[PDB]
Symmetry: D2
Subunit: 175 residues, 4 copies
């Protein structure tokens, strides 16, 4: 039967690299492997498919596919949850990777529900760019200073950066 | 600084035992440790506190407490999330344990949000009572047969049982 | 088929508690479970067997046993390795728990070989009794002071204690 | 202070990829990172150093290096163990990756001792090329058939291959 593996953590934790590592094990086992993302060994290669909408997944013929990866799952909405549940019901090994929290430390839909329903959950940590300890947050900086709680995701002409930080060095500025 | 560790999995996965194991490490380190639950080494013992409401946690003086456990967190509502966030902000190591899903395979509030915000997440599996493989679900049986999707949690006079099952042997009957 | 799971770590890491947790999953799956150590749910209970010698394991009829635990494996010599390999070959789930290192930080036979050959390996950490960080060592103290590199395991009339410590607070005194 | 992380598993388990993933977290934290192997982000890149002998490690000036990777550690002998112990004593985060067992299922020196002494140990599994279950072994095939227990590592003109297999599909032929 099928199952779901969930890979999560902050922006700099290497989630996507870990997803690919797991998928490449499929290749060496002579399995057919695909990875969906927001838009090789002895002849066997990961088939990568760029998508704009979660619903696109079901338009592909996956009957002969053993392992299905889905990267950056926070890009999609709650629809991806039932898709993943159906795929694993159908007998596929499904591996999903995405952010646990945004820059504000707010949970990123739909990872919470995916973590709750998945057979396996791995939360990867990064390393704090301030102190070098294990980190769990992503610090957004705008013009050198911590982003404010109500700063929009998209800006025009702003100097901005992201870095991994531990809880102790993560700052969300007041609105 | 503080952090949150999340222990989750099905009813028969040993979540509570794992919570206690982690807390007892605190004891051997000569830390002060408490565990809250829904209602010892060289003199140092886990202080267990039975509570009916999440809000009770904040009525206790925890200033000198190093490690705070909270068991069966699915008993509480979303209020427990900000409490846990505050406690870890305050510098405590907070360890929460609770169910990931109910008998229907539906996510059990508030574990999804807690998993999303926690530094560490461990999903424990049990062993399937049918086939002996790793299990992730809890099968509810009423009068020998799989519970229906819309069966109430409380019954009068029903023969009922729970057992660990893998996805392949977990059955939710139609309504 | 069978496999071997290895649980290791320092004296105060809760290895034995973790072993029991895993074994109790067997019970809830209605499996027959035994645990060997150096010398219950719905009728199904862990059968505990106290032994002086590794060779005793093979004198017991284990044909109907699903899960075999062996605690404190550092008590036994290298003979336990082939026994464990045979048991897992025979189709048993074998779970072994024991110390990784002694008070000197020296590897404790036969755990290194067992870790190398096992399908799964879990190294548990404790909490440092000095600083509260994750610990990997056991500090032996004799008359208040770090034990010396060539201090014997057995003493007469000595004041001695053990506590968990991180590498940074673990001290082995010169001979 | 420093510590040692050990990454192990069979030939097709992705050990080297996991090593690189961990090292790249160092980069994003603005740490100085090097990787030794048997013979980039915002200006910061992993410095890779090809070596023939473990003793070469100590001829490099590592005083300003935060994280030290060592890949394919089974290439080196027991000398690498004290080198790694010294480096971690010196305050470095040391990450070692290497094979747990050879094609015969025999422990590969010096990984057993490294696993015993390290703070963290991760054994990665691959996927069985026969049955698709989790695998822990590497099957060596010579002229289509399982390699014999006493077949040499080096051959002239032999058709040979390696594939990941579970214990149940791993075969070592009699001598
Ligand atoms: Zn920090
Ligand atoms: Zn089953
Ligand atoms: Zn310490
Ligand atoms: Zn197989």
């Amino acid at each position: 039967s099928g199952w779901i593996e969930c890979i999560t953590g902050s922006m700099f934790s290497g989630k996507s690299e870990e997803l690919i590592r797991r998928l490449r094990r499929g290749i060496y086992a002579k399995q057919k492997v695909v990875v969906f993302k927001p838009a090789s060994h002895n002849g066997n290669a990961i088939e990568a498919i760029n998508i704009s909408k979660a619903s696109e997944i079901m338009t592909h013929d996956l009957t002969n596919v053993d392992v299905i990866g889905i990267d950056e799952v926070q890009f999609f909405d709650d629809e991806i949850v039932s898709i993943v549940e159906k795929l694993s019901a159908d007998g596929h090994r499904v591996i999903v990777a995405g952010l646990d929290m945004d820059f504000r430390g707010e949970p990123f839909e739909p990872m919470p529900k995916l973590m709750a329903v998945s057979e396996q959950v791995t939360k990867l940590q990064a390393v704090c760019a301030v102190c070098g300890s294990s980190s769990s947050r992503t610090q957004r900086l705008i013009n050198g200073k911590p982003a404010k709680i109500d700063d929009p995701i998209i800006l025009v002409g702003a100097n901005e950066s992201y870095e991994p930080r531990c809880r102790a060095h993560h700052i969300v500025a007041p609105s």
